[PDB]
């Protein structure tokens, strides 16, 4: 029953949304059969399809808040070809804008920019232009400032996110931790030794103790409240360099000679 689910969202138990979803997944076969699966579209089938979208949709939002990624993504797979259909069915919704926003934030949290831009290219026509950027502006700008190199700007978007949280914090947390890592890596080569105050300020930590937590995890000596980046990172680098891949791609100077000589003489 489609209204049993419906009300489950308004009630505000998204744990209730979760436990009810598996019986409906057998039912969602039956919803599929109602539509002839887009072989011909009529207005009876416009109504039928409205229910299907709504069901999948309330289930999707639920998974982000219960932090279960796997379910969210799968539903999302479906959801896309569901939304893209024809030129406009009743795909346009307030939720449409909202759901896109989230997906993109997710792709950024996976630290997989490859797919982020791929997904962005898909959007960049019809939909991005008609809806302007008003919830889209949140992922476009986030991704954009991290590319630019201006970290200060990329950080402030994360903090201002507070007035809009409803399911966005589930990404906000993952994304931050990666941002401090990013800063730390750029600043590794820049300078070896930084005063205590500056290590904190850069990484935007609230507390000094949190700073020293990140050192230990990062395998860096703290010596007189000054970090030292040079040692371990270099050693590690050296060790990483030796593997069964990069041995045939080196090319030995003696090996270069052989190949030049025999090519003449073939």
């Amino acid at each position: 029953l489609t209204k049993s689910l419906s009300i489950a969202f308004e009630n505000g138990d998204y744990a209730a949304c979760e436990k009810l979803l598996p019986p409906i997944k057998i039912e969602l076969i039956k919803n599929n059969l109602l539509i002839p699966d887009l072989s011909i579209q009529n207005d009876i089938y416009l109504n039928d399809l409205m229910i299907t979208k709504r069901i999948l949709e309330v289930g999707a939002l639920a998974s982000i808040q219960t932090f279960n990624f796997d379910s969210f993504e799968n539903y999302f797979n479906q959801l896309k070809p569901y939304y893209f259909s024809n030129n406009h069915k009743l795909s346009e919704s307030d939720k449409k804008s909202k759901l896109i926003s989230l997906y993109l934030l997710n792709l950024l949290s996976q630290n997989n920019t490859t797919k982020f831009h791929s997904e962005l290219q898909y959007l960049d026509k019809h939909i991005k232009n008609l809806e302007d950027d008003s919830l889209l502006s949140y992922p476009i700008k986030l991704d954009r400032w991290l590319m630019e190199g201006s970290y200060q700007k990329a950080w402030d978007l994360l903090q201002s996110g507070s007035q809009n949280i409803s399911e966005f914090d589930s990404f906000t947390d993952i994304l931050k931790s990666a941002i401090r890592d990013e800063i730390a890596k750029n600043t590794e080569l820049s300078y070896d030794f930084l005063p205590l105050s500056n290590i904190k300020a850069l990484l935007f930590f609230n507390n000094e103790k949190e700073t020293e937590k990140f050192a230990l995890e990062r395998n860096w000596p703290i010596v007189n409240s000054k970090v030292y980046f040079n040692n371990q990172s270099k050693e590690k680098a050296d060790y990483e360099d030796e593997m069964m891949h990069e041995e045939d791609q080196k090319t030995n100077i003696i090996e270069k000679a052989m190949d030049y000589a025999i090519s003449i003489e073939n």
Binding site: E255, M258, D259, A261, I262
Partner: protein, 98 residues
């Protein structure tokens, strides 16, 4: 001086090593370094600016028993190098060897 020099087969010695062993002042040290060089017992050069003797040649002495083994250890290592290198390079550009 000949004893201190032979044991430390590294290519440089500070003046400080000589000073202590022979218990002489530093004035006398660099002269003593001139004498060895004149004998031909030793060959090398003297840096006064850093206070070093760079020894570049040692004069062979009586080869004790321990040293017979030492020689052998290095020669095996250098056998292998020639061996590894010839085998791989035959395989590389096998096609032409007229």
């Amino acid at each position: 001086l000949i004893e201190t020099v032979f044991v430390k087969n590294i290519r440089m010695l500070s003046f400080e090593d000589i000073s202590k062993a022979t218990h002489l002042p530093k004035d006398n040290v660099e002269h003593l370094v001139m004498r060895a060089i004149s004998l031909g017992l030793l060959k090398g050069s003297i840096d006064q600016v850093n206070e070093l003797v760079t020894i570049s040649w040692v004069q062979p002495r009586i080869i004790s028993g321990d040293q017979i083994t030492k020689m052998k250890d290095r020669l095996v290592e250098w056998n292998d190098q020639v061996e590894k290198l010839g085998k791989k390079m035959e395989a590389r550009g096998q096609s032409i060897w007229v």
